[PDB]
């Protein structure tokens with residue numbers, strides 16, 4: 001997938017966490033928000049590079065999905081033969097087929113929410129274990145709506161909007177504000193709701209999907225250049241698979257190749273600052289910023305333990321080994337600080 | 343244009359009101375509502391068949407336009423603000439809507455509730471008021487204040503809360519029908535759908551592997567009076583000055599190709615016919631009052647027994663009664 005760059009850094013963090021006995025630095029949750037069918041699940045799964053989320057027109061995502069990516073060491077390690085999933089609701093059942101993971105999301109949605117468009121705020125909890133992922137929580141959410149359909153109650157719009165707000169009001173979250181390119185940017189429900197919790201735009205990244213669907217005689221140049229609504233952290237255009245492409249089983253590799261080609265053809269002057277890989281790179285920088293910000297806390301915690309183990313060292317071997325491990329941890333922090341991504 | 347069918351009906355309705363000496367009723371205003379750039383101005387002007395309304399992506403309509411079609415007794419425009427100047431050039435009318443919008447709303451995306459008043463005089467129109475409105479929005483841009491969304495929404499409500507209005511609830515086909523701001527707001531003022539007609543624009547822009555069949559068959563959101571799909575000009579087509587005739591031809595062809603089983607109940611001509619039927623319903627509702635008025639004057643003139651005048655009016659009242667019956671029996675297409 002496109003978000004592997006941080007793996008060596010988080011491996012170093014894990015060494016420090018193992019010594020200090022706590023996972024002291026937690027990366028912000030990445031949460032997708034926007035109007036129904038704006039392409040949110042398509043964006044969120046593109047950061048995984050595996051097709052694990054149900055997608056489609058009409059309402060598809062109908063419960064929150066808390067997707068916890070869990071990095072797996074070479075010790076705990078097992079193509080598709082290296083990665084697996086577990087749901088809380090299916091206990092210790094292991095899923096190796098990502099199509100089956102997708103189907104189980106649909107299954108578990110239907111169990112709680114019914115089969116006629118109903119929505120539930122109860123999250124589905126999924127862990128994906130892989131040597132190719134960092135420790136990161138991605139949150140998929142139903143899109144905003146206007147008119148109740150199927151089983152939905154009269155106040156469905158507010159139910160969804162309040163559900164979204166509960167997730168994005170978390171200060172340690174990055175908001176992917178998703179708006180479709182075939183709508184005017186000023187109509188972005190994603191940007192409206194993001195500004196309610198993040199008025200200064202410190203943790204909101206604008207994604208413009210469906211660039212390929214724009215009416216002839218129109219384009220997103222002004223949008224992508226920040227000339228309509230400015231978005232501090234970035235406005236990044238993507239081209240995910242059409243419904244036809246999903247029906248035709250078009251691969252992730254081909255989706256990305258066609259996105260790249262599309263941007264070269266229609267947005268050549270902006271192409272190197274757009275696309276799915278660029279979205280991933282931008283997110284990586286935000287995640288690294290959080291790590292750097294938290295290093296002083298981590299260093300302080302190391303020192304608390306170092307002084308404490310030095311005191312036990314007037315169990316005497318226990319203290320000595322820990323002191324050396326903590327010396328190592330202090331060295332690792334400086335290394336992480338001075339690491340810059342390519 | 344596609345809305346000429348009512349001409350002969352209103353002509354005889356006018357004859358009846360003249361005979362009774364009463365003011366002819368006002369047909370309900372037809373008001374277009376929906377999200378910004380859903381294609382509202384494109385829909386509204388298609389009822390006239392002349393290209394008089396500024397259209398485009400981003401915010402274009404920034405003031406209400408009260409477009410009064412005026413039937414000319416045996417085509418030209420007049421704006422209330424340019425007094426007696428008569429416009430025969432419809433591109434110039436369109437440009438003047440843009441100019442007048444800038445005069446009041448400024449040149450940086452601001453919106454004003456002050457209406458532009460335009461009359462279009464034609465022998466091929468019925469006396470009808472069409473109201474064009476800015477679309478609903480979410481994030482302020484340019485000069486717009488923080489509460490621009492509420493300002494636009496309350497502006498729309500000021501128009502459609504009028505019980506004597508028909509609401510054209512416009513939703514783009516390349517959005518999910520459940521996200522229709524037009525239908526949400528319509529249901530607020532017209533909860534039982536007695537005066538809301540749903541238009542689905544931009545069928546041609548739907549993602550490959552998707553279509554509007556379920557939407558157009560009432561299987562997503564039911565809309566009592568109808569859900570009618572249309573294909574208006576793309577921005578490219580507008581830039582290239584593609585004609586109304588060509589737009590309509592291609593819309594017809596698109597519906598035959600992609601919606602053959604539904605084509606006869608969709609498209610701009612069918613939208614016009616559906617609106618004509620709704621307007622006829624309103625006309626029929628005015629007739630009982632007219633009937634009672636004739637009967638009052640009849641017994642009034644029959645008591646009078648100067649003489650030729652009373653004998654003529656007694657026959658003219660009989661004629662008016664007959665015309666009322668005819669109006670009730672008239673089929674429109």
Ligand SMILES: Nc1nc2c(ncn2[C@@H]2O[C@H](COP(=O)(O)OP(=O)(O)O)[C@@H](O)[C@H]2O)c(=O)[nH]1
Nearest residue numbers: 037038039040041042055056210239240242243
């Ligand atoms: N053509 C095109 N279709 C897209 C794009 N992104 C999403 N879609 C389609 O949009 C529909 C909704 O996508 P989905 O991810 O389920 O939207 P969500 O409801 O916001 O989670 C599906 O039919 C997708 O195939 C895009 O960039 N281009």
Ligand SMILES: Nc1nc2c(ncn2[C@@H]2O[C@H](COP(=O)(O)OP(=O)(O)O)[C@@H](O)[C@H]2O)c(=O)[nH]1
Nearest residue numbers: 379380381382383384397398399544574576577
């Ligand atoms: N392809 C296509 N474009 C349309 C259609 N209807 C409107 N448009 C385009 O949509 C944009 C907005 O149209 P407009 O009537 O100004 O929208 P309004 O803001 O709701 O009044 C313009 O660029 C039109 O060319 C349609 O049926 N098909």
Ligand code: ALF
Nearest residue numbers: 036037060061143
């Ligand atoms: F399936 Al959606 F917003 F329509 F996630």
Ligand code: ALF
Nearest residue numbers: 378379402403477
């Ligand atoms: F020009 Al609009 F809604 F964007 F009428």
Ligand SMILES: [Ca+2]
Nearest residue numbers: 328331332335
């Ligand atoms: Ca080392």
Ligand SMILES: [Mg+2]
Nearest residue numbers: 040041060061
């Ligand atoms: Mg989704």
Ligand SMILES: [Mg+2]
Nearest residue numbers: 382383402403
């Ligand atoms: Mg308009």
Ligand code: NA
Nearest residue numbers: 037056058060
């Ligand atoms: Na959807």
Ligand code: NA
Nearest residue numbers: 379398400402
């Ligand atoms: Na517009």
